Ligand binder design. Sequence first.
Ligand code: MN
Ligand code: MN
Lengths: 337, 337
Amino acid sequence: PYSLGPKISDWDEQRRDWLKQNPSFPNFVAPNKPRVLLVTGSAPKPCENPVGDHYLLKSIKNKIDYCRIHGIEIFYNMALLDAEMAGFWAKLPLIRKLLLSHPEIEFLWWMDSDAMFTDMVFELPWERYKDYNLVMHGWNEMVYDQKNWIGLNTGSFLLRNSQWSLDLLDAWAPMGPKGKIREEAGKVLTRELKDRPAFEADDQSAMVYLLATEREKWGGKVYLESGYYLHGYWGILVDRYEEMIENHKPGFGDHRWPLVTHFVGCKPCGKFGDYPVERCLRQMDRAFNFGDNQILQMYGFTHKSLGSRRVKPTRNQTDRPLDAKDEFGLLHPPFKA
Amino acid sequence: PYSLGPKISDWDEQRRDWLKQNPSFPNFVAPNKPRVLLVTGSAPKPCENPVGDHYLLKSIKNKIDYCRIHGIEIFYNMALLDAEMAGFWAKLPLIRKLLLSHPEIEFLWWMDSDAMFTDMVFELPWERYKDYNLVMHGWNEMVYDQKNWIGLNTGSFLLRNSQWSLDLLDAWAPMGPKGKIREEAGKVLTRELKDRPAFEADDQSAMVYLLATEREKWGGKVYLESGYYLHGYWGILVDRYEEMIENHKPGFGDHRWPLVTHFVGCKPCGKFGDYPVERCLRQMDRAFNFGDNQILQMYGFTHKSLGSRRVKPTRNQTDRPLDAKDEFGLLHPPFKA
Ligand SMILES: [Mn+2]
Ligand SMILES: [Mn+2]
């Protein structure tokens, strides 16, 4: 029987004792501000589609920028820790290892390489989640009533460092082991979930199924967020960027200015995507520049357009660089004070 | 004539005033630990040789890991701010912009994309530099006496946020403007510097020439460091990794375990390069794994060999993960306390 690791039952007590013995490493860097580790990753080998690595590079630059502004540490994984949990299941062993190795982290933010930050101002509403252990974008009706395989998203989620979360990982992993287990679990998921195509079990479908069938055990500590785009499906966002620039401003996080643009269905690095690679790549460039404009503007620059790598000044140089203060206070924000 | 920007003459007073008004952003994060921003970058377009982008991705992962452990923020530039200062000269306008935009940073650490951290334990000896404004790997005799074009290295250096440094940037830039200026400067540099081949002016040669011709003006505040490999030439280091693993341990930073392995002359993003690309990529793989083993060790894994992307456990999983303080104290080091 597959196991993520030796059973731990007293992790909340272990963390409590460790935190008391190591006050230099508090789990809350401030009142309503948990210590957060953002975790992402990609394969240790070059992309099968070679230009895909350039897009991975732009993706990590984008996350570096958001995390620098917001005081979040980053871990970038390139190692397969468990051959049975390859592919999109690889995040489970990695997450468990990081939680157990970093008792000082309160929340782990898993974020796919193909999920891009497009609101550099918006800060997660941490106080909203003080009584919750897992936060995912999604809708209660789609998950619990319809059992829709896209009723939630596992490409951008928050998981609290807690015994509950270790237990959740154990309950989530069973459909993952490569081979007959994952193949047959995929048949179950396609039969039981709404709108799922035929393919081996994936972690997102497995989470929908877990929550829909075991709601009494898990649902009370799960927050399905639909107020802002913790995950934002690219197809309904990327063509609207210029309208957002004209009508809105960074900071909204929702349809007015999405926190995350996530390129589900695109395969820039592998093969067999649902959308043409050329369309995906050009929209990924637009999303990158949409986010990057918010970084460059702190420094007096902007992209000439969302489709151009070239930048231009937004203002003249000055011999009093400290008299202004950037429009959105991202050079010296309270998240880093 | 070319100018990096309008003349500022009172930057030290401006920073002093800003720091007093913004005590939430001190320029020293600990008694003798300056606030440091590590700056790197790469050209905005995809590599002409697509696999080059994979190596840029491995490079930034490596820097993320070192900087997470050592409490250093990262800025990754992909924008050309000045068309005249193309190529490696592009770091001058970038550095100036970042210094003037981040008064809270005390040192900017410029590090090339082809420079990799290979000692994850070693911390820079900041107190050694308390009376200096520019720290580069090199030798006084090679720069000031021999005027050798490789007597110092500008691919990994520390520059203090100060008026002196603004003035240094102004004095360093004049040979940079692309075209006739850079071409004619290259003829002067090849004539005046020892061992320099014939090519247009580069920023490293221009720094040797500045210091050798204007030592009274600049030399007092420059620290040419040779006690550890703030820069380390890959061609003499990479073959010795096995010997280092057998005989030494991380933390020395020098010939026993180099802080930086720098792949000067390797150009995996372009078509040429001074050295055969095959050895370049194989040795970049080894340097990445040499550094990555120090990260993975914390988590109970190691690369199967220095040439392999695969990893293996170094120990069994446990239900008491917090009793093991990792060998080199990198999970909870004092740099992040
Ligand atoms: Mn995804
Ligand atoms: Mn270099």
